[PDB]
């Protein structure tokens, strides 16, 4: 592939690898029906900011759960090739679990 | 004598050094000094005809064809479309003299021109320009010391204003408003003394409102110890005169309140519409009632108001004025002793200003109305209201009165005076000549040149009055030498005596000192320039 991992802390070489070929957007997506956010205080804004990433974090967590279930050791590894982009938040979340991921594949 | 350098290499290869060097021009050495001196001499000779009581005016035309007849040297040089850099330096010198002093903007230019002419003669004789500048600097130091020595102190007390009147008259003698000479002098003195800080502090010129209106006569110009406003009463049926008015200065429009933040008031039922209409009506009624409760007689607003408030004010016997400017609001608050109130909720009787008389004034067959607020208790703001036969004399009177105000301000800052008419110049030239005798030979030429340049003011004054310059100046100098009297000058008005102390020709000492200093440093700066690099592009 003509591209590599976009996270600086990502692993550069995986000996034994499990391949997860996916076409799921792991970056932030806007609602099709022009949602917009309404709040009245800074704490409400913080709660809305934290809760607006729940949808993507659910799929990232599903990937993490699959990773932890397949291999409970550090010997093997997961390479995630995604046809769609991955935002830096999900990239960091995946990197913290020792998963190398690729975005915007052909 | 231009194009900089042009060699194209000893080997025939291109030799390009400076961008667009083939279209640029330069001057070096004594030629640049000669050109600068020529330009400065031309400017000074043009300006020297407008010096003294017999000086003549210059009719200045701008880009758009507007015409300003004026005698102020700073204005004359500011409105000129000069292109020479030395001319721009002369204009900056005049602007500096106007800024620091406010008077003597023409003497500085003539003095600088005479100094540069004498420097031209010295350079032709073969003296380094830096030596000339140093000699001029030390001669200026000697002259300033002599001016300090021969100065006289005057009283700046309100009880006796005669020396102040004489000084203002001396300032206004050369202007066209000398037909009302003592009247303008007195109104300027009273204006400056009214708005001033007693302990020799500054005088704030923005507490003086100088406004002019065409028509009437120049003699009709008067000092109003209050505020004059271009606005009038809002309702045409409101009374045109209020006696013992209790002013209510407000900065909030007489309209329903409106939040600054983006807001939307939702009406969802007929009851909401009824409540909204009732709220608007009650807001109008309550703002009118709040204004009336304080006992005020007049209401002054800055941001205007609508029809319901206007008719409610008329119905409640409350004359009102709208759309008054911020500076005018501040002046009214200062003069009447009231406080600026941001909203009706904070309006109290203690914040109401007091004006003895508020009147609306007509100006003939013009439909124009202007409001007069005067007869204040202890007004700390003053207004000068100028009338004339045409707008041009009105502008000239404005700048002449500004000169008088600046002169009285200088007197307040420092009360030491010297006697004009060229007497101070003659005494300074004599002192410089005496000091030159004790000086070594090399700087003696610079000292003598400085003295000769100082002597140009009496010659200009005598020539402008039709007398023979050299003979009159020599006779006055001889009389000054024979008997100890530094107050002998050029009798421009032909009053029969040369004693300027008796003629009451009085000038501020700091004005003369600033004249000499500024002329000296500008002459030094011009002399130190030995190279010019103009673009030479002749751009459109």
């Amino acid at each position: 592939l003509d591209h590599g991992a976009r996270h600086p802390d990502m692993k550069k070489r995986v000996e034994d690898a499990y391949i997860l070929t996916c076409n799921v957007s792991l970056e932030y997506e806007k609602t099709e029906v022009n949602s917009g956010f309404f709040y009245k205080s800074a704490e409400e804004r913080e709660k809305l900011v934290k809760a607006e990433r729940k949808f993507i974090e659910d799929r990232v967590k599903k990937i993490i759960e699959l990773k932890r279930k397949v291999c409970g050791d550090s010997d093997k590894g997961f390479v995630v090739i995604n046809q769609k982009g991955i935002d830096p938040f999900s990239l960091d979340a995946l990197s913290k679990e020792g998963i190398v991921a690729l975005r915007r594949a052909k | 004598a231009s194009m900089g350098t042009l060699a194209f290499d000893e080997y025939g290869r291109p030799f390009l050094i400076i961008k667009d060097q083939d279209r640029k021009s330069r001057l070096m050495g004594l030629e640049a000094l000669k050109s600068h001196i020529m330009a400065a001499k031309a400017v000074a000779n043009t300006m020297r005809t407008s010096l003294g009581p017999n000086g003549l005016d210059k009719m200045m035309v701008d880009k758009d064809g507007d015409v300003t007849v004026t005698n102020d040297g700073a204005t004359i040089l500011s409105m000129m479309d000069v292109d020479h850099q030395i001319a721009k330096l002369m204009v900056e010198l005049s602007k500096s003299q106007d800024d620091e002093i406010g008077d003597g903007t023409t003497g500085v230019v003539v003095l600088a021109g005479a100094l540069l002419e004498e420097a031209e003669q010295l350079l032709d004789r073969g003296i380094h320009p830096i030596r000339i500048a140093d000699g001029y600097e030390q001669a200026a130091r000697v002259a300033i010391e002599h001016l300090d020595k021969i100065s006289d102190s005057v009283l700046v007390d309100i009880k006796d204003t005669e020396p102040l009147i004489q000084t203002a008259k001396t300032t206004l003698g050369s202007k066209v408003v000398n037909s009302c000479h003592r009247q303008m002098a007195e109104i300027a003195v009273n204006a400056v003394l009214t708005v001033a800080d007693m302990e020799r502090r500054d005088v704030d010129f923005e507490l003086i409102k100088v406004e002019g209106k065409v028509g009437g006569r120049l003699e009709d110009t008067k000092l109003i110890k209050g505020v004059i406003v271009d606005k009038d009463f809002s309702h045409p049926q409101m009374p045109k005169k209020v006696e013992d008015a209790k002013i209510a200065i407000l900065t909030c429009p007489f309209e329903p309140p409106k939040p600054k933040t983006k807001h939307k008031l939702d009406v969802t039922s007929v009851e909401d519409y009824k409540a909204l209409q009732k709220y608007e009506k009650e807001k109008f009624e309550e703002m009118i009632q709040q204004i009336k409760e304080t006992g005020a007689n007049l209401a002054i607003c800055q941001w205007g108001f609508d029809d319901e408030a206007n008719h409610l004010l008329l119905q409640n016997n409350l004359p009102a004025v709208r759309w008054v400017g911020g500076p005018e609001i501040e002046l009214i608050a200062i003069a009447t002793g009231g406080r600026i109130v941001p909203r009706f909720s904070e309006l109290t009787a203690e914040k109401l200003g007091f004006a003895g008389l508020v009147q609306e004034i007509s100006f003939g067959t013009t439909k124009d109305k202007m409001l007069v607020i005067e007869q204040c208790k202890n007004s700390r703001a003053v207004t000068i209201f100028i009338r004339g036969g045409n707008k041009m004399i009105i502008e000239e009177a404005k700048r002449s009165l500004h000169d008088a105000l600046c002169v009285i301000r200088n007197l307040i800052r420092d009360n030491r005076v010297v006697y004009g008419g060229g007497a101070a110049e003659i005494s300074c030239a004599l002192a410089v000549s005496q000091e030159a005798d004790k000086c070594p030979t090399l700087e003696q030429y610079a000292m003598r040149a400085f003295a000769d340049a100082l002597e140009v003011i009496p010659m200009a004054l005598s020539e402008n009055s039709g007398m023979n310059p050299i003979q009159t100046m020599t006779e006055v100098r001889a009389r000054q030498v024979k008997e100890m009297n530094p107050a002998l000058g050029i009798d421009c008005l032909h009053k029969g005596t040369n004693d300027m102390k008796q003629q009451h020709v009085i000038e501020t000492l700091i004005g003369k000192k600033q004249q000499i200093s500024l002329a000296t440093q500008m002459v030094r700066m011009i002399l130190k320039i030995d190279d010019i690099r103009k673009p030479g592009e002749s751009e459109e």
């Binding site: - | 060699a7 290499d9 000893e10 080997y11 290869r13 291109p14 030799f15 390009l16 050094i17 400076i18 961008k19 850099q85 721009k88 330096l89 900056e92 602007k95 500096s96 003299q97 106007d98 800024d99 620091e100 002093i101 830096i130 140093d134 600097e137 005088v203 507490l207 900065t251 409106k258 939040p259 600054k260 933040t261 983006k262 807001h263 939307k264 008031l265 939702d266 969802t268 709220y279 911020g326 609001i329 501040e330 608050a333 200062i334 406080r339 600026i340 909203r343 600033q514 200093s517 500024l518 440093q521 500008m522 700066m525 130190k528 320039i529 190279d531 010019i532 690099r533 673009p535 751009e539």
Partner: protein, 525 residues
């Protein structure tokens, strides 16, 4: 030359190769140096440059003159670059660097013509420069006494020497005392941004003053400002970064109400927010209020009613200087306006300064800053005064960093030339001619001083050479006496690092110019 059917480089490419282009480069450097020759020494003159816009600039500083010249010659631009480098690192001697580099090139031009290999010239320049720098470090006069009075005298003498070449040379003692006093108040870094320089038109040069505090121009006062008192005898200053106006609470804030009572409550809430900020400021005990952000008319009238002073849109640098002088803290929020965050000055006043209104903060005992107020009859007059004071300030700062001085007026360079000639007398001979040429080129500065002063350069140079050979390290050109004199006893003092940097930069520029054999100019895009 034969026309190739397919040419190598694009059409219009100009190439010059060999000795002729090196000679042309040397001549270009001479041309650039000639434009700044007369601006050297106490008898130097000023230059006037007019741009395309017609705004003339008048300067005695070499770096400024070179920058205002649109030099496009690739070899000539090196002189401008090294002048800027000398101005950056040292601040004085921007004419000496160019003069020395051009003199080096002129001296080695005859040897370049006769086919001498440029690497030999470069090695000779490097050797001579190292020897000269070592000699300067060795013979620089420093005193190990550690006392305030003589250190201050040294600083004042250095400032006077750096100032005795400009239009303010008549008041050089006064301005040097001002500059030394200004620099001594900077705490540890001697930051230039802590020395304010305000230019006010109109007035004599002697009317210029240095305030032990901070001063800045009045900034667009609103209505009701004239009712505020303009003098305080022990004010507390509330330095702020706060918008004191009626405004939307936030850009993306929308208020939705469906009741007239709620409408009135919202209006009263906006007014209450503004009055709460104002009341907190007032109850903080401060009397003078300054802010980066605008202060509205409502706040101005509120402060006027409390006999307080307000000023909005004060520039960042002015508030920084005010904080350094008074010892407060710029607060973006007014919720905690304690006593330790409020500035304090002995006297605050608004006065008339030459047709303008200026706010004066004086009497600060712990001030780490200052503000120059410069008076003059013209805009360019005050600009050149500011440039001269900048040169003096840089010299004084460098002398604070290290107080090693050498006599000026060409004494140091005459001594260096004598030492270099003595060294060159004891080497095989291929390097001897080049080192002797370097030593001879070191004589340009006294010669230029004599030429600008109108002396006879040859006789003065002969006397200086004889005196230096016989003995006496600090004998230079005496401008006033038409002769030579001991310039150390005449207090013509300049820091040694000025000459060190000048020699280093001139040598590097000369070596870079000599090391080029081809010039290629691609066609302009």
């Amino acid at each position: 030359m034969m026309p190739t059917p397919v040419i190598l480089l694009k059409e219009g490419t100009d190439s010059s190769q060999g000795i002729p282009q090196l000679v042309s480069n040397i001549s270009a450097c001479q041309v650039i140096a000639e434009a700044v020759r007369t601006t050297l020494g106490p008898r130097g003159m000023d230059k006037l440059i007019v741009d395309g816009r017609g705004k003339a600039t008048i300067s005695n500083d070499g770096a400024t003159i070179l920058k205002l010249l649109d030099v496009v010659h690739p070899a000539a631009k090196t002189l401008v670059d090294i002048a800027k480098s000398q101005d950056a690192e040292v601040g004085d001697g921007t004419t000496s660097v160019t003069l020395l580099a051009a003199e080096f090139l002129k001296q080695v031009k005859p040897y370049v013509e006769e086919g001498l290999h440029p690497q030999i010239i470069i090695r000779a320049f490097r050797t001579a420069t190292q020897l000269a720098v070592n000699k300067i470090k060795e013979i620089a006069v420093t005193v190990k006494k550690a006392d305030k009075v003589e250190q201050r005298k040294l600083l004042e003498k250095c400032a006077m020497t750096a100032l005795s070449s400009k239009l303010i040379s008549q008041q050089k003692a006064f301005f040097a005392k001002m500059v030394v006093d200004a620099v001594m108040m900077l705490d540890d870094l001697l930051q230039l941004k802590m020395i304010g320089i305000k230019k006010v038109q109109g007035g004599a040069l002697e009317d210029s003053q240095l305030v032990a505090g901070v001063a800045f121009k009045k900034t667009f006062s609103y209505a009701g400002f004239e009712m505020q008192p303009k003098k305080y005898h022990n004010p507390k200053i509330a330095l702020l970064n706060v918008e004191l106006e009626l405004k939307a609470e936030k850009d993306n804030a929308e208020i939705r109400v469906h009741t007239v009572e709620d409408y009135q409550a919202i209006v009263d809430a906006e007014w209450n927010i503004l009055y709460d900020k104002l009341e907190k400021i007032h109850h903080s005990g401060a009397k003078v209020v300054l802010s980066k952000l605008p202060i509205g008319d409502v706040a101005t009238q509120y402060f006027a009613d409390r006999d307080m002073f307000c000023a909005g849109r004060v520039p960042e640098e002015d508030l920084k200087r005010t904080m350094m002088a008074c010892g407060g803290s710029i607060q973006t929020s007014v919720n905690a306006l304690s006593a330790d965050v409020l500035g304090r000055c002995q006297v605050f006043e608004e006065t008339q300064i030459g047709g303008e209104r200026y706010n004066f903060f004086t009497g600060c005992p712990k001030a780490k800053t200052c503000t120059f107020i410069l008076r003059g009859g013209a805009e360019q007059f005050m600009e050149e005064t500011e440039r001269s004071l900048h040169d003096a300030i840089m010299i004084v700062r460098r002398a604070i960093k290290n107080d090693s001085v050498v006599a000026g007026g060409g004494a140091i360079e005459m001594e260096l030339s004598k030492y270099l000639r003595d060294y060159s007398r004891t080497i095989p001979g291929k390097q001897q001619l080049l080192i002797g040429a370097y030593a001879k080129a070191l004589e340009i500065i006294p010669r230029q001083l004599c030429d600008n002063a109108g002396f006879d350069a040859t006789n003065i140079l002969n006397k200086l050479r004889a005196r230096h050979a016989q003995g006496g390290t600090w004998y230079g050109v005496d401008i006033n006496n038409e002769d030579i004199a001991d310039n150390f006893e005449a207090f013509v003092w300049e820091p040694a690092m000025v000459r060190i940097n000048a020699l280093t930069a001139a040598s590097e520029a000369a070596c870079l110019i000599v090391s080029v054999d081809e010039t290629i100019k691609n066609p302009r895009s």
